[PDB]
Amino acid sequence: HHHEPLILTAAITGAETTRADQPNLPITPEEQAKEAKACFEAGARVIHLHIREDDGRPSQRLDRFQEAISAIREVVPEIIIQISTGGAVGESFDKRLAPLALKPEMATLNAGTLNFGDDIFINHPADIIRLAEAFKQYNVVPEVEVYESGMVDAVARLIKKGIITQNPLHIQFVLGVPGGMSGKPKNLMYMMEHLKEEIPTATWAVAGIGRWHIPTSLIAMVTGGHIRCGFEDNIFYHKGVIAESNAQLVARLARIAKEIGRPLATPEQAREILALN
Amino acid sequence: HHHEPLILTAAITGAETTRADQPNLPITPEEQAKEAKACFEAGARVIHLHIREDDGRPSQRLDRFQEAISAIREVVPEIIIQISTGGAVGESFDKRLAPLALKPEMATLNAGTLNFGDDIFINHPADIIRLAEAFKQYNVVPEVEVYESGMVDAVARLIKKGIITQNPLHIQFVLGVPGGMSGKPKNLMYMMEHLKEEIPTATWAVAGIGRWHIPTSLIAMVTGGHIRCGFEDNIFYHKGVIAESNAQLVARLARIAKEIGRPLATPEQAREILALN
Amino acid sequence: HHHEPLILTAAITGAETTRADQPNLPITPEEQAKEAKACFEAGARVIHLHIREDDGRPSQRLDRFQEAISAIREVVPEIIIQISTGGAVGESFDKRLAPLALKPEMATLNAGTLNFGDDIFINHPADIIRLAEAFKQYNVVPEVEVYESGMVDAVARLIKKGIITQNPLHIQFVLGVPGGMSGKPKNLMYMMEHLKEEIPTATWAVAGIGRWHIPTSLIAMVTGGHIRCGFEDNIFYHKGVIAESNAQLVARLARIAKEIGRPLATPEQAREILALN
Amino acid sequence: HHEPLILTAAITGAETTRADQPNLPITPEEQAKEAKACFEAGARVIHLHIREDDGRPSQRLDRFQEAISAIREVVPEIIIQISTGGAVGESFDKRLAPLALKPEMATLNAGTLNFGDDIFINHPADIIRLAEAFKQYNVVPEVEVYESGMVDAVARLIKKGIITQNPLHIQFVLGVPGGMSGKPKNLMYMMEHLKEEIPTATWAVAGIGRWHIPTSLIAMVTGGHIRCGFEDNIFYHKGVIAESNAQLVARLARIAKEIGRPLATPEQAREILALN
Ligand SMILES: C[C@H](N)CC(=O)CC(=O)O
Ligand SMILES: C[C@H](N)CC(=O)CC(=O)O
Ligand SMILES: C[C@H](N)CC(=O)CC(=O)O
Ligand SMILES: C[C@H](N)CC(=O)CC(=O)O
Ligand SMILES: [Mg+2]
Ligand SMILES: [Zn+2]
Ligand SMILES: [Zn+2]
Ligand SMILES: [Zn+2]
Ligand SMILES: [Zn+2]
Secondary structure: OOOOOEOEEEEOOOOOOOOOOOOOOOOOHHHHHHHHHHHHHHOEEEEEEOEEOOOOOEEOOHHHHHHHHHHHHHHOOOOEEEEOOOOOOOOOHHHHHHHHHHOOOEEEEEOOOEEEOOEEEOOOHHHHHHHHHHHHHHOOEEEEEEOOHHHHHHHHHHHHOOOOOOOOOEEEEEEOOEOEOOOOHHHHHHHHHHHHHHOOOOEEEEEEOHHHHHHHHHHHHHHOOEEEEOOOOOOEEEOOEEOOOHHHHHHHHHHHHHHHOOOEOOHHHHHHHOOOO | OOOOOEOEEEEOOOOOOOOOOOOOOOOOHHHHHHHHHHHHHHOOOEEEEOEEOOOOOEEOOHHHHHHHHHHHHHHOOOOEEEEOOOOOOOOOHHHHHHHHHHOOOEEEEEOOOEEEOOEEEOOOHHHHHHHHHHHHHOOOEEEEEEOOHHHHHHHHHHHHOOOOOOOOOEEEEEEOOEOEOOOOHHHHHHHHHHHHHHOOOOEEEEEEOHHHHHHHHHHHHHHOOEEEEOOOOOOEEEOOEEOOOHHHHHHHHHHHHHHHOOOEOOHHHHHHHOOOO | OOOOOEOEEEEOOOOOOOOOOOOOOOOOHHHHHHHHHHHHHHOOOEEEEOEEOOOOOEEOOHHHHHHHHHHHHHHOOOOEEEEOOOOOOOOOHHHHHHHHHHOOOEEEEEOOOEEEOOEEEOOOHHHHHHHHHHHHHOOOEEEEEEOOHHHHHHHHHHHHOOOOOOOOOEEEEEEOOEOEOOOOHHHHHHHHHHHHHHOOOOEEEEEEOHHHHHHHHHHHHOOOOEEEEOOOOOOEEEOOEEOOOHHHHHHHHHHHHHHHOOOEOOHHHHHHHOOOO | OOOOEOEEEEOOOOOOOOOOOOOOOOOHHHHHHHHHHHHHHOEEEEEEOEEOOOOOEEOOHHHHHHHHHHHHHHOOOOEEEEOOOOOOOOOHHHHHHHHHHOOOEEEEEOOOEEEOOEEEOOOHHHHHHHHHHHHHOOOEEEEEEOOHHHHHHHHHHHHOOOOOOOOOEEEEEEOOEOEOOOOHHHHHHHHHHHHHHOOOOEEEEEEOHHHHHHHHHHHHHHOOEEEEOOOOOOEEEOOEEOOOHHHHHHHHHHHHHHHOOOEOOHHHHHHHOOOO
16 A cells, blocks of 8 residues: 555665775765765665774674764664664674664564575574574564565564564565575565465565665555665666665655655654554 | 666546546547647657547547547647547447547557446457457557456457457556456556466556556556556546646656656657557 | 365356267256265265256246255255356346245355356346345355456455445355456466455355366365366366266365365355355 | 376485384385385386485485485386485585486585574585586486575576576475475465576476475476475375375375376486486
């Protein structure tokens, strides 16, 4: 339904994107804060946050996460800061889990292992359980990341076992990873229906990597889904035309939502939908 | 694919819409010409044409069709004028077929019978064959209208029997009629896949009646489909806000196509895709 | 789920099938009673009944329907006798409605109009309402016949208007009619999912005409659906091999259900599922 | 439901235990006896894992040769497909080496996934190494797919010329805890997804545990081929342990006979799977 409020998430930095490809990539807490302000003004209500060292290397340092979180909340106190527990491929699970200790409002929870480009993004079943238990210990709301159909079933089993008790649960379909399910329209339609069958009360969002950004976004617009965009997932505005800011990508989605009459969620509505109150 | 040229059709008048509900409805040839020019400038490449008497009653008069066609050609000679052979529900089949004698570039060919609101839109199998023979007699390219899954199979059988020889064939999915298949995303995805299985070389467009205009349009945008809009099908710009003009509906679709980088077909490209050149 | 009880319906005679193609076709009430007993023993719990005159002509005579109903009830009182309100294409709606006055446990209710072979099977919206009101008047439970996606929506609107109050409602997908939706696996999967979305509490069965009998039956077996078989819909046991009787077609489905461990509904369970108690 | 049906019997596997399934064939002679009964019941392919006498999964070349020779002797016409999957946690080097035995066919796992409490690892560089060995040893692969994304990954290996097999045989392995389930919606989605991404590919389905019956009956009427057996499912009915792999094969053959779908002859199975 294209009248339910739309939540836009900006995945502004990520762990893979470089300035070789996207020179406008925000790397420092100050750059991330400036980008978060422009994204919030463009319509984003959530920042999906990865941090980097000054040299651009991915980081898991708690004091660096605090620096970025502080800089963003000082410029836009209303935005929801969602910490990544995914980090860079190959990072140790202990370093990935530890920032839950900063007690953010929300953080991601990756629901399975998959080949990821030339490497493997590992989420051992015992570590998924350890992380789900840590979400309860640190009192953080999860965004559950799903890259394949089978990950929805795996999450439904963790719900049945009482390991994931978050209700309503927010699921993010991450489509277009080389090794994961693509963002073709048939796949997004299949995933939302599959999720409705297996976890009927779950809410959902979609992140369309690269070329899949536009097809996933426009389908989510008219099916009641929420949308993630940003340099972490896609650096192009048009084929061969880099976007000049994460805010440009957010603003296009907000303009399309305005065209079709789908309202953007207020910060209050975004916290209500995602059960962050 | 959202890189293939987009053909926008404006169904500007129709047989059911009234001036009482939509005061901006073009009824006279002069009003239809003014609307067609504004629609073409907004991005439309096809006008789906029904005619009316000055009092708003649906008409099948050949002089009135000639007047509307000439008035539109006078101000926008590049637009494709597609005559309706559907007309008003209950109209005699003889009166529905006769305007093909005007040798338009294109005309609609309804592929089956269905309950339509409180009445029945009748297309007897023998009359569908008579109409297909008249299209060939007057060298008119059809737009085959389908309202249900079974109409695709019925068209595939007419192709197998050598009754429909148009190649490539252009199919329009008309979704949202009370009595026909709705325009929900699941249905449009099903129909394009069903059509690919049964008539692999067919091209397609979608008309989303009323509330289905936005979901059908945005799915067609990113799946390579073409789109029909207009007062015949939908009088609202937003929920509860009746639109200013057909051009206002066309312009929104053109702006969304520009946002996502899907080019609008030139008149030459539209004629090539629809095999009118 | 392939463990919920399976209801088998035998459509033993119909209005189209001839003795010239199928010499085992039961035509008289005595032949229909003998067939119904053999079908019940093979696993059928419902008889879908059309009647014929002694010369094989389709009939709508109430005395002839009473004779067939009484003959079947005398030899197999546990079977559910479902009378057809569809009859032969082109029959008057008054003659089609009249047998509801015999107060059968169940009867079919055709939910829309469609081209049917070279003719049109007409179900005017006002007549569908008249029929649905007559079902309630005579305390007859309907089996709602749907041939296309749009007919599910039309039934959902009759439920919303309080015209169809039957809860749970039993829908039968009639697939493979020339002019209607085919019985290909994609279509049956689409229809059960479409029905779950639009009428969530409805139960369903499938009738796969001719070549579609086996694909529809095996999909329904493992998706919790119920199945109709019989000479009305298909006269062949294998491609080009005429069946010996309706009981032969029923027995195969019962054997497949036994193989996979799906229990056959007892007469008591069939009446509970179809809300005939 | 008229195109010939190929039935594969996955008779042993690496996970199933004798305690849960006392009829589990473990030794080459037990595997040969089972393969003969399966062939007579309608199987045209044996999906083979080997075990040591103590039931532990094995990768020993002499043990694979013993099992292959024993099966070959009792049923020469059956297609022996060796597993390159082996047991979860087995080294990739040990998993690849049996291709040197030049079997008629072997499995090629197309991706990594969580698998029960562990992870079934197929590193992208190892998938490439394995696909290259298939070409060098002139072995026809059966490509194992557990998720939608693995179809796309296989399409990319075809584009890169790493997989040159044409037509390519894909097996959907559905119902693994961690992988895509075998519900009817999923099998319908996968066959359509495969037709879109690899149009000339043929396919089979393996429905683990509770998914055996739904996957089998959908494949029966959609032209797909079917895998059954103790590796994937030990029950004949819910809570009723199966008596042999041949019992599971025979049920599928009886259902195929009921609906008039012919079973592939050994010659037809080799033609469809391009083993000639
Ligand atoms: C492998 C990806 N960099 C992990 C990721 O970005 C998902 C998350 O943020 O939780
Ligand atoms: C019954 C419909 N008003 C006929 C119609 O509008 C379709 C067409 O133009 O061909
Ligand atoms: C026109 C159809 N032969 C009528 C029919 O057989 C459907 C029903 O029984 O309700
Ligand atoms: C993890 C499974 N035991 C590996 C397997 O059985 C797949 C194959 O045979 O190629
Ligand atoms: Mg005049
Ligand atoms: Zn991330
Ligand atoms: Zn029209
Ligand atoms: Zn009938
Ligand atoms: Zn295996």
